[PDB]
Ligand binder design. Structure first.
Ligand SMILES: *Cc1c(COP(=O)(O)O)cnc(C)c1O
Ligand SMILES: *Cc1c(COP(=O)(O)O)cnc(C)c1O
Ligand SMILES: CSCCC(=O)C(=O)O
Ligand SMILES: CSCCC(=O)C(=O)O
Lengths: 368, 367
């Protein structure tokens, strides 16, 4: 008796693997992304208030309260919102409902750890499109993007703000995509879990330009510093939504109720108390600190416009040697690139305390 | 642009759709099974202690504490335990790991609405194996079981205490089933979310007869009256575990940290405080009460051995036409069987207050 060949895709993600390596080595974890602080008090109290009164099942699509709250933020009706057990389940169930054997899916590179595996588990094939790493940071070359479409291609998967690059797609760029989308009738899947986490002008969502074909993915845990709550969501044309609620219902049924209840209150409060504004500033401060401290170490640093990840190049090192000898953990570029990853490109996470970032800066320092 | 054909199965499940109808109609919801009371105090307290301390990502396989708590209850080691976002995810991930294009999966009948869709979504066939229905009650047939076994069969999928029959499989039958599996070199998927909800005698576990190929599935929701916590588990041979964690990794990454944290303490407190003991007590009453009350009316009632459900026969009736006039929710057998499902067989659910049980009978009587 042997497992089905499909299970060849079930390999320990690099993120949780390095997190274990770090505790074991007493290293500073700047790898897997998750805040070192607890989530805001209003979320915790909202969850506390839900325990003992909203502990049982919830409609597969989500608690009405949560849907209504997402509806307002997005300016859509409740029917167009489906609450999943994390953005992770949103992405899996999405690809699952949009591609299959013989179908192609464009995926920008470097990509996010869950895409390819999700694609493969659906049957589709990865149409990687490597962004250029010019001395001014990454950038999408629409020509190279365009040269990658075919009669098979049934969908395009975007990530903005982008993990791990930190790139924020600009208006003109989104047009070009919503455009190409329509031209070949391609589906649009936008991973925007970091929608509220940007450091410049407020980005323009992608559903604006190509509403009829856009699926926008978000995460409560990436919004409210509570990555362990597993409450995510899909927002797209209401006609398809009912099926998606059908899919995710076989995968896990519905998200945790008391957590769905708490996030519901928390999303509205957050919009009223200016929580996202403060969070962004707290992140910009730590972004500049890390990037600035690395700069002083004559390293090449590519300042991000969004998310709490940043990319730098450390000459002549590799994750596993760095974690053991410098006591600092990082995610190696080869985790995002399917082939030939820019040697010496590492990803730093700065959703940590100022003291952890400094500790990393000092340890990396005396290891010239 | 159209959604991939696979979505054929992505059809709203009956249970949440009937609860919406029941609710909306002001009808007693003895359909979808979920307790009317809140989870025990020691589970809420423990979750509360976790909020603020354990809110970030846990490992895909699960929180060390939880895996260890389960490891002790099942007499195995942590590595053979993988925590899932509810049992529902156990099943999905499971069937998706043992069968694909070309494989077949034996399934008993009546079934749990998740079974075929999963098999279906796995790209494999799921030949059924209906059970009998003598006056005594349901009945298994190792013969039919023995027959459905073809060369393409990769695994069987048991479920005891069985939902929706309340049937608690006996030792000789498990063992009998164990034999088949080892002979044909099959996998055994045991859905045991109701392992602690039995009205009879401490039921034996399949894994005691074929521990080398049996995957046991459980659920904190069913054990602890907290169905919305979405914390479940798969306990199987350690050699296959690293893979199962890798599959669920891609589905929902890992279960809710605070809930996993709280369930971990609760599983231990439960044994100690004799919680399960008493949970079985109160479920007995409500079991007897709801069935006797149906005899007084004069119907065919099958007193279950386990679970908090129970099936009965309602003369020339159906589903929606009931939740409209009688204003009481029930589940028609059409959801458990694929074709030609028994006449007038409706599954209730007595995990409600005594009040709700009574008030459900009244509205039943005047019809
Ligand atoms: C964190 C992350 C996810 C997953 O979010 P969850 O809600 O934790 O499952 C998906 N996509 C990207 C790009 C992420 O950074
Ligand atoms: C409740 C139930 C499930 C699902 O359990 P979750 O932990 O809520 O996902 C699966 N199988 C049976 C027989 C059940 O009764
Ligand atoms: C869900 S694993 C971690 C995902 C993430 O935020 C990361 O890119 O580190
Ligand atoms: C499929 S959600 C409901 C699960 C359950 O307990 C039931 O069968 O009623």
């Amino acid at each position: 008796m042997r497992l089905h060949p499909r299970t060849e895709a079930a390999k320990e993600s690099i993120f949780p693997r390095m997190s274990g390596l770090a505790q074991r080595l007493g290293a500073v974890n700047l790898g897997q992304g998750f805040p070192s602080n607890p989530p805001p008090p209003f979320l915790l109290e909202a969850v506390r208030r839900a325990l003992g009164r909203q502990d049982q099942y919830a409609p597969p699509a989500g608690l009405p309260a949560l849907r209504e709250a997402l509806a307002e933020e997005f300016a859509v009706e409740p029917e167009s919102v489906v609450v999943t057990s994390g953005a992770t389940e949103a992405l899996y169930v999405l690809l699952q409902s949009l591609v299959g054997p013989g179908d192609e899916v464009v995926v920008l590179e470097p990509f996010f750890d869950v895409y390819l595996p999700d694609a493969f588990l659906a049957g589709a094939k990865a149409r990687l499109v490597r962004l250029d790493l010019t001395p001014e940071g990454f950038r999408l070359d629409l020509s190279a993007l365009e040269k990658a479409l075919t009669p098979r291609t049934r969908a395009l998967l975007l990530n903005t703000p982008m993990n791990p690059t930190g790139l924020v797609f600009g208006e003109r760029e989104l047009e070009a995509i919503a455009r190409l989308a329509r031209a070949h009738d391609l589906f649009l899947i936008s991973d925007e879990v970091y929608d509220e986490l940007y450091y410049g002008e407020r980005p323009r969502r992608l559903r604006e330009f190509a509403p009829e074909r856009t699926f926008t993915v978000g995460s409560a845990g990436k919004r409210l510093e509570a990555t362990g709550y597993r409450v995510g969501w899909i927002v797209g044309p209401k006609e398809f939504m009912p099926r998606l609620a059908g899919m995710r219902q076989w995968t896990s049924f519905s998200a945790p109720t008391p957590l769905q209840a708490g996030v519901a209150e928390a999303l509205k409060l957050a919009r009223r108390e200016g929580f996202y504004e403060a969070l962004r500033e707290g992140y910009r401060r730590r972004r500049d600190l890390l990037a600035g401290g690395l700069r002083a170490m004559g390293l090449r640093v590519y300042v991000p416009e969004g998310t709490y990840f940043l990319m730098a190049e450390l000459p002549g090192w590799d994750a596993f040697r760095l974690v053991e000898e410098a006591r600092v953990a990082l995610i190696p570029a080869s985790a995002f690139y399917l082939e030939d990853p820019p040697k010496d490109l590492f990803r730093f996470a700065f959703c940590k305390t100022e003291e952890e970032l400094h500790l990393a800066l000092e340890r990396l320092g005396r290891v010239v």
